[PDB]
Amino acid sequence: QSVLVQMREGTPIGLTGIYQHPNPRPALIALYEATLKELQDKHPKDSVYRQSIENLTAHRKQIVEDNEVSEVIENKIGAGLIEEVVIQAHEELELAKKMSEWKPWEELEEKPLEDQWVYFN
Amino acid sequence: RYLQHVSDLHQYAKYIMAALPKYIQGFSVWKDELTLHVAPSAVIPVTTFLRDNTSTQYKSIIDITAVDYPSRENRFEVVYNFLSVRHNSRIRLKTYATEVTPVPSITCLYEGANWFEREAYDMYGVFFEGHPDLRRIMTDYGFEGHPLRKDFPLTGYTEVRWDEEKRRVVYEPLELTQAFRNFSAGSTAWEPVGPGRDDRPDSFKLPTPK
Amino acid sequence: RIRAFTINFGVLRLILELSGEEIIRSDPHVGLLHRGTEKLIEYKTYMQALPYFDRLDYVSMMTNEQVFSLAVEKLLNVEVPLRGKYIRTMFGEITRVLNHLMSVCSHAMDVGALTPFLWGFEEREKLMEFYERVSGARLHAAYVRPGGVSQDLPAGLLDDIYMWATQFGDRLDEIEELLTDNRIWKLRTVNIGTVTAQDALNLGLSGPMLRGSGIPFDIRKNAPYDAYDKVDFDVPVGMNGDCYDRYLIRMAEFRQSLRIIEQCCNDMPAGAVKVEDFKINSPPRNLMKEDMEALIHHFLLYTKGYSVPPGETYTAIEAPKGEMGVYVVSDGSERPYKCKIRAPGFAHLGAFDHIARGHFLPDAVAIIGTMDLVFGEVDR
Amino acid sequence: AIIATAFAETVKFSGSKQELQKRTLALYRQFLRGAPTFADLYEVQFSIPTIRTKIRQEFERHRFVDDLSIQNVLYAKGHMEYQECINFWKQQAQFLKYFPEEDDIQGRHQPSNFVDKFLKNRA
Amino acid sequence: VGQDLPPVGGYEPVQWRRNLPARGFRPLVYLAALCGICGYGFYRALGGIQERRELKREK
Amino acid sequence: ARQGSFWPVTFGLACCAVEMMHVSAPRYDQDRLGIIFRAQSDIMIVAGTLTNKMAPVLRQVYDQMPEPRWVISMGSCANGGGYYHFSYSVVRGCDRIVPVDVYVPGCPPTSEALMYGVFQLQRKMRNTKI
Amino acid sequence: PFDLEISTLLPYVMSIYLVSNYGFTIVLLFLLILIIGFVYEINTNALKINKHNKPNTDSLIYK
Amino acid sequence: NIYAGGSAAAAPPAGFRIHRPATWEESEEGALSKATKYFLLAEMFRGLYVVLEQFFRAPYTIYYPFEKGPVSPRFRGEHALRRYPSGEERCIACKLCEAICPALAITIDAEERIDGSRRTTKYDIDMTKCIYCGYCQESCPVDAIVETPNVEYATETREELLYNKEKLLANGDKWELELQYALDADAPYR
Amino acid sequence: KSKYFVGYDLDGNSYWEFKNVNNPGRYRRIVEPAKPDLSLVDHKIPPQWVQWLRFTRPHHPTLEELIADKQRQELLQAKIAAYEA
Amino acid sequence: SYPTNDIAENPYWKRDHRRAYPQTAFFDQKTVTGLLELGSEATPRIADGEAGTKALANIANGGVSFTQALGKSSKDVIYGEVLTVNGLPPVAPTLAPKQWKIIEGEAAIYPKGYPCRTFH
Numbered sequence A: 001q002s003v004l005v006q007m008r009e010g011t012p013i014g015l016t017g018i019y020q021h022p023n024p025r026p027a028l029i030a031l032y033e034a035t036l037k038e039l040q041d042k043h044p045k046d047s048v049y050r051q052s053i054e055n056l057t058a059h060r061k062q063i064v065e066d067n068e069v070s071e072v073i074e075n076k077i078g079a080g081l082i083e084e085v086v087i088q089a090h091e092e093l094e095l096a097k098k099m100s101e102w103k104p105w106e107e108l109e110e111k112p113l114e115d116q117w118v119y120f121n
Numbered sequence B: 001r002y003l004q005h006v007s008d009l010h011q012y013a014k015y016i017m018a019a020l021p022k023y024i025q026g027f028s029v030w031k032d033e034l035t036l037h038v039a040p041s042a043v044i045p046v047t048t049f050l051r052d053n054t055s056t057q058y059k060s061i062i063d064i065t066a067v068d069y070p071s072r073e074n075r076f077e078v079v080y081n082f083l084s085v086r087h088n089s090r091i092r093l094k095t096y097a098t099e100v101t102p103v104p105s106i107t108c109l110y111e112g113a114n115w116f117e118r119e120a121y122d123m124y125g126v127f128f129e130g131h132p133d134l135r136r137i138m139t140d141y142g143f144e145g146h147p148l149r150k151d152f153p154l155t156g157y158t159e160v161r162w163d164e165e166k167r168r169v170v171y172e173p174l175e176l177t178q179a180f181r182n183f184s185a186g187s188t189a190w191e192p193v194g195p196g197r198d199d200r201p202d203s204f205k206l207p208t209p210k
Numbered sequence C: 001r002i003r004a005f006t007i008n009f010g011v012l013r014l015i016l017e018l019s020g021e022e023i024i025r026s027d028p029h030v031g032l033l034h035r036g037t038e039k040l041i042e043y044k045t046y047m048q049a050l051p052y053f054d055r056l057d058y059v060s061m062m063t064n065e066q067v068f069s070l071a072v073e074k075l076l077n078v079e080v081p082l083r084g085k086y087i088r089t090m091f092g093e094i095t096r097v098l099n100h101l102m103s104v105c106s107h108a109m110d111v112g113a114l115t116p117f118l119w120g121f122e123e124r125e126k127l128m129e130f131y132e133r134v135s136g137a138r139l140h141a142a143y144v145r146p147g148g149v150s151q152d153l154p155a156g157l158l159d160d161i162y163m164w165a166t167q168f169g170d171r172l173d174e175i176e177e178l179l180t181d182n183r184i185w186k187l188r189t190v191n192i193g194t195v196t197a198q199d200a201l202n203l204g205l206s207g208p209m210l211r212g213s214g215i216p217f218d219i220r221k222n223a224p225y226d227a228y229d230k231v232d233f234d235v236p237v238g239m240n241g242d243c244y245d246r247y248l249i250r251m252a253e254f255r256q257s258l259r260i261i262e263q264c265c266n267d268m269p270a271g272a273v274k275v276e277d278f279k280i281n282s283p284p285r286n287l288m289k290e291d292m293e294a295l296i297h298h299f300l301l302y303t304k305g306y307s308v309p310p311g312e313t314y315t316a317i318e319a320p321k322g323e324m325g326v327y328v329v330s331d332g333s334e335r336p337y338k339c340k341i342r343a344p345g346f347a348h349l350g351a352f353d354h355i356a357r358g359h360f361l362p363d364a365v366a367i368i369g370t371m372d373l374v375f376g377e378v379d380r
Numbered sequence D: 001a002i003i004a005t006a007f008a009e010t011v012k013f014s015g016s017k018q019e020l021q022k023r024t025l026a027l028y029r030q031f032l033r034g035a036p037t038f039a040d041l042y043e044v045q046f047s048i049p050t051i052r053t054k055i056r057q058e059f060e061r062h063r064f065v066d067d068l069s070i071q072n073v074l075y076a077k078g079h080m081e082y083q084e085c086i087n088f089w090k091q092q093a094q095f096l097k098y099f100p101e102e103d104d105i106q107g108r109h110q111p112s113n114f115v116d117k118f119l120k121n122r123a
Numbered sequence E: 001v002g003q004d005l006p007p008v009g010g011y012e013p014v015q016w017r018r019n020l021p022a023r024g025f026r027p028l029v030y031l032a033a034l035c036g037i038c039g040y041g042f043y044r045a046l047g048g049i050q051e052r053r054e055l056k057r058e059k
Numbered sequence F: 001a002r003q004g005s006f007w008p009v010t011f012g013l014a015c016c017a018v019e020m021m022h023v024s025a026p027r028y029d030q031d032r033l034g035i036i037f038r039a040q041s042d043i044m045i046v047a048g049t050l051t052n053k054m055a056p057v058l059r060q061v062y063d064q065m066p067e068p069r070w071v072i073s074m075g076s077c078a079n080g081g082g083y084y085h086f087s088y089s090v091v092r093g094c095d096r097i098v099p100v101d102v103y104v105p106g107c108p109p110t111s112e113a114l115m116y117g118v119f120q121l122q123r124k125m126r127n128t129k130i
Numbered sequence G: 001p002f003d004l005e006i007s008t009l010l011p012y013v014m015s016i017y018l019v020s021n022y023g024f025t026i027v028l029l030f031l032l033i034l035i036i037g038f039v040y041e042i043n044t045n046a047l048k049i050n051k052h053n054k055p056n057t058d059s060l061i062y063k
Numbered sequence H: 001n002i003y004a005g006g007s008a009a010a011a012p013p014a015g016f017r018i019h020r021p022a023t024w025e026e027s028e029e030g031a032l033s034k035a036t037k038y039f040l041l042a043e044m045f046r047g048l049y050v051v052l053e054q055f056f057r058a059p060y061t062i063y064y065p066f067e068k069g070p071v072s073p074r075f076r077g078e079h080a081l082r083r084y085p086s087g088e089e090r091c092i093a094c095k096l097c098e099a100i101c102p103a104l105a106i107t108i109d110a111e112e113r114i115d116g117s118r119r120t121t122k123y124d125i126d127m128t129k130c131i132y133c134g135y136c137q138e139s140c141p142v143d144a145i146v147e148t149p150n151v152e153y154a155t156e157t158r159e160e161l162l163y164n165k166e167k168l169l170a171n172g173d174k175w176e177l178e179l180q181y182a183l184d185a186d187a188p189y190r
Numbered sequence I: 001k002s003k004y005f006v007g008y009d010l011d012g013n014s015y016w017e018f019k020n021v022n023n024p025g026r027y028r029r030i031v032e033p034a035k036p037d038l039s040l041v042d043h044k045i046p047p048q049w050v051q052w053l054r055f056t057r058p059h060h061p062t063l064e065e066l067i068a069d070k071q072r073q074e075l076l077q078a079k080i081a082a083y084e085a
Numbered sequence J: 001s002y003p004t005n006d007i008a009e010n011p012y013w014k015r016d017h018r019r020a021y022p023q024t025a026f027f028d029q030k031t032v033t034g035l036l037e038l039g040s041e042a043t044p045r046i047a048d049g050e051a052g053t054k055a056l057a058n059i060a061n062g063g064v065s066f067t068q069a070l071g072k073s074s075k076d077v078i079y080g081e082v083l084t085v086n087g088l089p090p091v092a093p094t095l096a097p098k099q100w101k102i103i104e105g106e107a108a109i110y111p112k113g114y115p116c117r118t119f120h
């Protein structure tokens, strides 16, 4: 199934270019479940990245799943508006999908020279 | 507050290095400023992580530039500046690039960045691989050289005057009526400042044994 | 095949490719006023590098002076006194009043309204008298040094700043009355130059244009400086991303800065205006003579200058054009190793052909005057 | 800036020498094909064959360059110069930077031997 | 000593709000006046047309 | 007619262009003799720093003027380079490009000094009697 | 065709007294036939010139 | 509480969700009342009236060749080398004004006489490149160079614009009493 | 304008002020040149009064002060030639 | 003012702020492994002061790696000094946090109908 994360036409809210999203909570929780499924499937369980984003979207999804109205959860999240929260959840989801192929949990591949991060000391 | 806050910034950056160990070489803080020390093939993934994470959403390129130290084998260092307008935070990203090798361009992510990248190109000759409209800006069109570079002199190589004969302006090697007199020769021969104290919190410097 | 013809639309060259009336792509040239001011300050001390900043962005000169004399102060680890902080706050705010008094009444001329440009100039003349009585020359006041503020106020100046602030509310409401409600003004500017809130960020925009689109951010209230903390201040932020709301935010910032000028007149304390020591700024010429050490310090601050700890900083403040930062790198010597400005209009003109697509050709003129291009900024 | 300008290409760095040779080949074809435009555009005095033999002798200057990435920067600079020349961005006094030896003979006494250098102490 | 200071009581507060005192009448009042002055004008005009027609009869 | 009306095609290109517009401001009008700086006449005014890029553009604007022509150089960046005299991309005064007849010195030379330069130039134009 | 109905209207305005009650209705019908072609062109948005400045406001669809 | 992470106490403020724009039927004025403003150009005549108010008041304009605008004592215009009372040149060849100038306009040649006192053989300011920062006034310990408040000195050649020692001593000769008055009135604040 | 006389200089010009403290933006001090020479725009104004025109010197200068100024410069010339010797 | 230029008790070094400047806390790839394994001057994990320096010196020579330091790290280490104490990533920190009012009534600078709000 597909999900819409940002209406570009509708009634206006304070941020221009961003209009009011119909039914933001099912979009939100399905996008969350995609985040949880991707980082459980593709990142190895040592790595700090998947651990904090797992805990992050779990604690974020708990607020969405357990409270109903618009304004109270957009205060309890503490980030922006719910349209904007859906956009940044979409964004961290696309990030977590790029990280499975860019693979950041390795050791570093390009060691610096010893005389390079030396400024004036 | 401010002591607590700089000690908080230290810990945030320790987390940023631990989240991406393949790409981040170092981090340094100096007075509520955070610099991330990144390889040149490591630019694009770190910048996507800075744009995209919810803890780390910087969204907005402010200004980028290079700086040359000719005393290093990798000559230029290319520094990026970002601003999370949500979290009210600034972050800095330094890579390196020799005169001849590139650094990859972040203009796929940041839309304002391309104009900055060709500015730093003309001032420094630093390449941005993957960049539409890489060419000079804010210098002369036929200008040969890169100005903000330590081998390039102050007054440059050429000058402009109207030749009567050709009925056009002509470009000629440099002749001055008054030579430039730098007064940098005549600086102090004593060390001017001490080493200075540190602002490292007690939690992030190495323990002494016993 | 669409065939677009090209035309050669301060000093600025700007290529337009037109399919009839519509702009399909636009390409601003820049560089015809690039004079190399970023490389020259590497060969001059900081006391000598100070006028290179009212050379650039000359309309609001004290704010451009201030951003360098804040990056230096942060890199020095010194502290301007309290009287210095209020004094630099209110001169930066009459500088804001001057910049918007030019920018509003020049967007009004480019659109076509000819009365506010003339009316604005008379008001501006009173402000250039306020500069002329404080520094020597008008339009290039070097008055904020890096150590602090160059010299003390005149004897009867604060009274005249109040005498101006009384009438200026009425003379601002007067120019406001015939533009804000005006149908031609409103018609030509409600759907022109709209900027979405996500693309206001990716273009690197700031100031009145980032606050046009709805995002509440300004460096005066977010990361304050220079006794803008100690002085009460609201900020206006518009809804739609158009050019009318950028106009409307400017119209509001006149009133907010008049409020700051009044609070700075009333809450002004007594104190020293320069920093206390004399290894970074000059002794008074009273006791430069009589003391031996002050003679020594005078001679060394002028033949050499003061020396700065090694390091790097990026200090950014809110110029009335937008976020203006400066990035200075200190060798540890008395000449800066490298120092780049972030001109605010640089990314405003860089954002042009993402904003000005699909607009008419006179719709490419009203969009100019609210991205506020003075071109001491954009080339530099 | 989403769209690029007219004749631009995304600057991209080849990993082989033969692909670079193909690109410089296509590049010389572009200069040589656009050479009749430059005489009309910049209002030069002289003939199109002199423009063409100059484009040739400016690629003669870098024929024996070994290093791959120096050939790479040299290609990028040549494409930037084509980009400026094919439009009207350069003017007719910066297009004639390229021809200083053609326009006028400066006078007598071009020194050749050590004596003619030395009578005006190497000029 | 000698530097300038604010007065000890402080200055009086300046006007930084918007001063737009309403000075137009109600729009229906202007429209009622417009309809009245029009209708009186048409009274005079069509009366003049009828009088000019009677003079044309006489000529 | 040339005396009593004087319409300089202004080349205000930097800092001094606003000081030139302070003549067009209600204080220092010069509305009365008849100089109007609001905009094919026979004088131009170079005011601000003349870069490397612009010297052909300056000469091309100076070329398409009617023949009995003059030019005054306002500011210090427009005569002998000025503040930016040792920069690489700058013309050290427009004496390298255009033949200038009066100089108005000052880095921001006050509308006082610019207008006084114009009066000196009008005396020169009348003593010509071409 | 809108300048030229005006000159079809010019002979009525001189002779308005003679054609009383009858040339009235003929002119009214003439104008009322012209108004429907006028409302044709203003229903069809004929003079308005359009451009491509809208991003078409399509919502962002995922997966 | 604890915040979500990726998230701070900078939530959206209470009321940042702005209301729906009201339709035509949730408008307080009638369509006839709105059309009276629409057709009779209600705010056009208001802005017409403002410019007519400005027509009947007394203008700001001043005569230049017979009146000069308001100036400060600390104003800066053409240079001058001062002198002492009882006639003495006061520039002691101390070389500070040359070392500070941000545009390198000063050029001084210094030579010492038999007397042991120090003066300048050749003093020089290039006024094509002086930028009027007044640092040269601020640096000289003996108060020997100043900024006279003259601005009306526009010249016709550049060779006239190269000020040597003789021209600046003449400028210190002519402007003296107003110069001394301005420096004495400035002197508390320096 | 409602003229007052408030000075006669050395050179011959009449220094007139009018419409005083009423209006802020009122230009207050003007000079009659006494020489309406046709199209001629030079007037040698002595340097002491120029400051009085510029709102910097509030106190009125006298004519005897001007002639003493000129005599001061002339006597200084003999002093400077003696010192150069 | 006078307390800066008193004649009794003003050593220059007490009011001195140019020399008491902070230094850039630069952190290598390796000194962060040292922070994860040796511990800290707040919470040390090192006894045997003679064999302490020996356990320090292999990390200073490149003995263990950073991914190995993260694999060998306990959950108390990871939730104490890498992550927050609630297992959350830290927020991008700001010096003086800014909480926003929205002024709405007659104290606003534009009434309802104009699109500009006047936040605070």
Ligand SMILES: CCCCCCCCCCCC(=O)OC[C@H](COP(=O)(O)OCC[N+](C)(C)C)OC(=O)CCCCCCCCCCC
Binding pocket: E038, E039, E040, E042, E043, E044, E045, E046, E047, E048, E050, E051
């Ligand atoms: C559409 C309109 C409907 C409303 C009608 C109400 C009008 C009041 C009746 C008064 C009649 C009267 O008594 O006036 C009579 C006058 C002429 O007067 P006389 O020359 O002396 O007549 C001669 C006397 N004999 C006959 C005995 C010899 O004729 C008029 O011009 C009145 C017209 C009123 C103006 C209507 C125009 C409305 C605006 C239309 C533009 C949109």
Ligand code: SF4
Binding pocket: C055, F014, F015, F016, F047, F048, F049, F074, F075, F076, F077, F078, F082, F083, F106, F107, F108
């Ligand atoms: S002459 Fe002076 S004020 Fe004028 S543009 Fe040049 S530097 Fe700026």
Ligand code: SF4
Binding pocket: H100, H101, H102, H103, H104, H105, H106, H125, H129, H130, H131, H132, H133, H134, H135, H136, H137
């Ligand atoms: S005023 Fe400035 S530029 Fe001029 S001589 Fe003095 S220090 Fe130099």
Ligand code: SF4
Binding pocket: H090, H091, H092, H093, H094, H095, H096, H097, H098, H108, H139, H140, H141, H142, H143, H144, H145
């Ligand atoms: S004017 Fe002052 S700084 Fe210059 S040589 Fe004379 S005493 Fe020295």
